[PDB]
Ligand binder design. Structure first.
Ligand SMILES: Cc1cc2nc3c(=O)[nH]c(=O)nc-3n(C[C@H](O)[C@H](O)[C@H](O)COP(=O)(O)OP(=O)(O)OC[C@H]3O[C@@H](n4cnc5c(N)ncnc54)[C@H](O)[C@@H]3O)c2cc1C
Ligand SMILES: Cc1cc2nc3c(=O)[nH]c(=O)nc-3n(C[C@H](O)[C@H](O)[C@H](O)COP(=O)(O)OP(=O)(O)OC[C@H]3O[C@@H](n4cnc5c(N)ncnc54)[C@H](O)[C@@H]3O)c2cc1C
Lengths: 611, 611
């Protein structure tokens, strides 16, 4: 009798993986090179942002830790894109790097099913194309039914500061892993190399708080976790805004031809290069903890020579006397081409071997965590012999991410920010639980008191929308309100509640003004979530139906997975630039085929009147 | 304008060093390879013990952090040698390893004079035999007036598990430093190599809490820091006692010839080898935190092959199903021969360069911390041009340690436990503040409210001892007490308080029983400290005078630093051996000369009728 799943690496993918395997009721072994460093935040002292916020909430909705961890460890909470719509609202908080990592370990150590081991994996062994065991530095083999690899930037890592380069997996402070990459190539795996940068850290006390403008967390912040109740008290530090000078840019041009991130997006070098017309660039100074002196210089990711970096930083207003604790650097690492893995996070070359995280050439904690979660769930499912889970592009940002990963192949690590997923309103942060909670249940990650509670919150919204049409509102109550708001004047018999609250009126502006409505529905009053959902469902009726119709169109397309071993030289009126892109790329699903820039909308129509 | 003191390495020596330099009002630069790891407790999850407790309190008394840190971070407090006397009482507490480290960083970061840098030093540059600068990995030179080196086990470190060996400075998880040792040898420094072991860590949950006997922290524990007020609430975890079997020893004999710690004291291998007559050995299972699952297996330091270790551990009762998170290993490292440094912690080969910690071939946090403190103080003094501080063997355990270090030259790292410092009662833990507090003041480390407070506590003790000869106690009050204690029966007029409290009666047993005494002195009541001091001063009158008389002979002979420039060839009635040990060792003080095992009591007498 041995282990079920052994998860290598206890970073962001590794944790969500090991936690999912354990909470899924299977014996799990977490192997990692350094326990002092579980879930360490190597780069940004923050979680969330444009696409990252949504994907974090979706991790929470499925029963993952990252959501809870940031609510537990936040330093300033700030929602991005406030003036924009529900689809644009993006949750983001600063983390206490060290306190975040401690929390994540604490959780992993309190889960009975996870045994821990501090060693480095230098090889994975496999018999006739299916996983068997894993070789640690000592040369032991450790036997398991299925293994998740979550190695981040450690596989033959190299640190680049200007022209010199040192061994190092995350920072110079970490030894790189050396055995494993050759061992995997030995099992028929192709691999490339990626570079990603981190900005320098500076001593807070060396900053001129007379010039730099302070940016506090917003009054009444938003919790990532649907289980959390408040994060009001978690507004402990604020961040600090500045911009760069034309004079900063001159200093940095010096080192361009030395920095191994300069290209032809991940640089300040690259930024000034691709945009020499903007005479300014934003930088955010972010404390890394509530009482550390270490400060992260956002938007200044760099590989310039150590001496040029300080010269640049000091030119930035507010940082004339900046003391630099670490230089910014780039990490070069081995990654495994994302076509080699399935949508299910399982690998093609070997069954029961899953890849999650930076190792798939993605970048981001949230991005890595989401993969770890799925890879974890699916490792349990495989051992049980149950159905593996793939999320749809109409279901989650995670679905879009994992699909885009295995599909879109490019020389740069995949970030979700440039990902302008046209499915926006239906995938907004605030309904993630409704969408994914049931899927969470099937994987033993969401409690019944949770699952059943989300099943009832949807019942109330639609039950309320019943009343929002019947309910009537006389021009006696709202006319004086509308006079001041300068909105639509109610000359007449407008009731049809929905027809009122659309152009710029709150749902609560009505319940407050008519006895009619609150009598028919005061349940939304008592619950603030229903109130929030209903108010959007009707204020965005038009656009939701429009988006959902396309999502179903795209759902139907992604639901024809049978195009494989058939003559691409059978189709009648195709090609001339299509057909050649089809034979080159070889699309798995016909939905995947409609995103190749070579094929036309008219070409995929002739592939449908076929399959 | 540059830096004053740059301290390399932020371990135990490094911190006390950097903190002493800063609190001493000088600009300081702490350079260390990894900030995530300041003051990390690489080995034992505890502070104090036999000699180590006293030396911690003495660090506190001088204005160091280690005392405060363990009061802040203790998990179980336990005084060792309870049944023995005041000289034997030794304070010791378990630390939350991770929480201890965090505290120590927090303090260093809140000291304005310390700037921080994360880099590795690969060289120290010097002009005409005096310190000038320090070369970091990038090849920058960083200029300073004086530099403390506190590198611990990192200088060309090598990890030994049985027969295979990996690079690594503290654990496998750390890169070793490579440039510096050759650069120092280049400046005329000899260096050797030492090996020290750490025991394996095990998962708490894999322990059989039916067999293992629990050892709670003692009711009413003792604070290390004289500034702390209680540590009562800091009894959060307890430790777990077991012993080894004859069967454990058989399993371990297998790997003896592989383990590079086996010799001919630092091993379980060595222990069973040197003592095969004892059919049992003690092991202490110590949690490393209040809520970590990681557990330290004290008394099982080992270098045996990874597979033999687990086989051994499982044979120990209570650990039949033990899951091992890490193997025990040995660390081999470069150290600099302690004769090359002065008593003042400054080096002979180069002025303004100080050596502190494991780099002087000592072992222990406290041992390292104490050196750091002194090295720090003396770096400030040198730059100011003030008197350097050397502590005497009658003043502190730190004085004994530093003297023994530069004097006693042996193939093994120096530990204070085997150090049976005959000066015991005068150096007990509980008066450390009185002895050293004034010395602390001169170095800007002890506040006036502190210094003046210790100057007044001594006033009360002697002021009380005035009254303890005068005050009277009738046989009416104590006779019933003495009847139960079965002590001396008071037939008659015994007053003379002192004459009462001697054979087995508390000072507080009297104040409680006679109206006479508390009326004449209730000040000792209010200062439970005065009460504690007085009670010993009189219960140990005989032995204190006896010890102090010998200490005064060693006092005089300490400060006979005159024989600087003369040959041992012009000295008459000396040798055989005696003259050859003198030319070899080359003693600084003639007191130091009388402790060399080669020279006789009659030989030093002919060195005195001379100087
Ligand atoms: C330019 C740039 C921009 C970025 N922007 C963002 C951003 O906007 N938002 C954001 O959240 N993040 C951002 N990051 C991303 C972040 O740096 C990485 O994505 C993250 O460090 C990788 O996560 P991971 O879980 O996949 O692996 P890691 O967290 O790096 O995990 C590696 C862990 O596995 C262990 N390990 C590795 N290999 C082995 C082995 N073989 N044997 C045993 N143990 C092993 C190690 O101990 C380590 O702890 C950015 C990074 C860059 C470079
Ligand atoms: C067998 C054994 C028994 C022990 N028993 C005890 C005991 O009973 N009680 C006890 O308290 N302890 C015990 N220990 C002792 C303990 O393991 C060491 O003494 C301690 O780790 C060394 O302390 P230090 O301050 O000198 O250096 P360290 O704490 O090891 O400091 C090294 C630090 O300096 C930095 N650094 C090093 N070199 C450089 C460089 N060149 N450039 C930049 N930064 C650098 C690193 O980042 C690191 O954090 C024991 C150890 C062994 C092996």
């Amino acid at each position: 009798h041995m282990y079920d799943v052994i998860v290598v690496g206890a970073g962001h993918a590794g944790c969500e993986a090991a936690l999912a395997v354990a909470r899924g009721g299977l014996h799990c072994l977490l192997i990692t090179s350094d326990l002092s460093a579980v879930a360490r935040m190597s780069c940004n002292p923050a979680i969330g942002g444009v696409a990252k916020g949504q994907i974090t909430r979706e991790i929470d909705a499925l029963g993952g830790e990252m959501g809870k961890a940031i609510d537990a460890t936040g330093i300033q909470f700030r929602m991005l894109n406030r003036s924009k719509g529900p689809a644009m609202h993006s949750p983001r908080a600063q983390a206490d790097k060290t306190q975040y990592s401690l929390y994540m370990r604490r959780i992993v150590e309190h889960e009975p099913n996870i045994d821990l081991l501090q060693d480095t994996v230098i090889g994975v062994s496999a018999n006739s194309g299916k996983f068997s065991s894993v070789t640690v530095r000592s040369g032991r083999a450790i036997q398991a039914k299925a293994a998740i690899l979550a190695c981040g930037t450690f596989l033959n890592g190299l640190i680049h500061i200007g022209m010199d380069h040192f061994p190092g997996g995350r920072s110079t402070a970490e030894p790189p892993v050396e055995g494993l990459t050759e061992s995997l190539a030995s099992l028929g795996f192709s691999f490339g190399r990626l570079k990603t940068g981190t900005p320098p850290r500076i001593d807070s006390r060396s900053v001129d708080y007379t010039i730099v403008t302070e940016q506090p967390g917003d009054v009444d912040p938003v919790p990532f976790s649907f289980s959390s109740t408040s994060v009001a008290n978690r507004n402990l530090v604020s961040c600090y805004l500045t911009k760069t000078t034309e004079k900063t840019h001159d200093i940095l041009r010096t080192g361009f031809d030395r920095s191994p991130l300069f290209t032809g997006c991940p640089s300040i070098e690259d930024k000034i290069s691709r945009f020499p017309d903007k005479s300014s660039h934003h930088i955010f100074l972010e404390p890394e903890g509530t009482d550390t002196v270490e400060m992260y210089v956002n938007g200044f990711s760099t590989s310039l020579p150590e001496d040029i970096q300080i010269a640049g930083l000091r030119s930035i207003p507010g940082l004339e006397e900046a003391k630099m604790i670490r230089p910014g650097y780039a990490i070069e690492y081995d990654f495994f081409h994302p076509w080699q893995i399935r949508s299910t996070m399982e690998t093609r070359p070997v069954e029961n071997l899953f890849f999650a995280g930076q190792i798939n050439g993605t970048s981001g904690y949230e991005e890595a965590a989401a993969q770890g979660l799925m890879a974890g769930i699916n490792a349990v499912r495989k051992i049980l012999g149950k159905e593996l889970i793939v999320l749809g592009r109409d279901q989650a940002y995670i679905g879009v991410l994992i699909d885009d990963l295995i599909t879109k192949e490019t020389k740069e690590p995949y970030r979700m920010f440039t990902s302008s997923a046209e499915h926006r309103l239906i995938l907004r942060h605030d309904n993630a639980d409704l969408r994914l909670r049931k899927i969470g249940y099937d994987c033993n990650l969401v409690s019944s008191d949770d699952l059943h509670r989300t099943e009832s919150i949807i019942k109330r919204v639609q039950h309320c929308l019943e009343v929002m049409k019947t309910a009537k509102v006389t021009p006696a109550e709202i006319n004086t309100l509308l006079m001041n708001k300068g909105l639509q004047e109610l000359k007449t018999p407008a009731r049809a509640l929905s027809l009122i609250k659309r152009p710029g009126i709150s749902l609560q502006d009505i319940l407050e003004h008519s006895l009619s409505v609150r009598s028919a529905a005061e349940e939304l009053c008592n619950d603030p979530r229903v109130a929030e959902q209903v108010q959007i469902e009707i204020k965005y009726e038009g656009y939701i139906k429009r988006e959902q119709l396309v999502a179903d169109r795209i759902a139907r397309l992604d639901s024809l997975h049978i195009p494989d071993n058939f003559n691409y030289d059978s189709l009648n009126s195709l090609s001339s630039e299509g057909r050649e892109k089809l034979l080159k790329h070889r699309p798995a699903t016909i939905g995947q085929a409609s995103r190749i820039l070579g094929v036309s909308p008219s070409d995929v129509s002739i592939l449908m009147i076929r399959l």
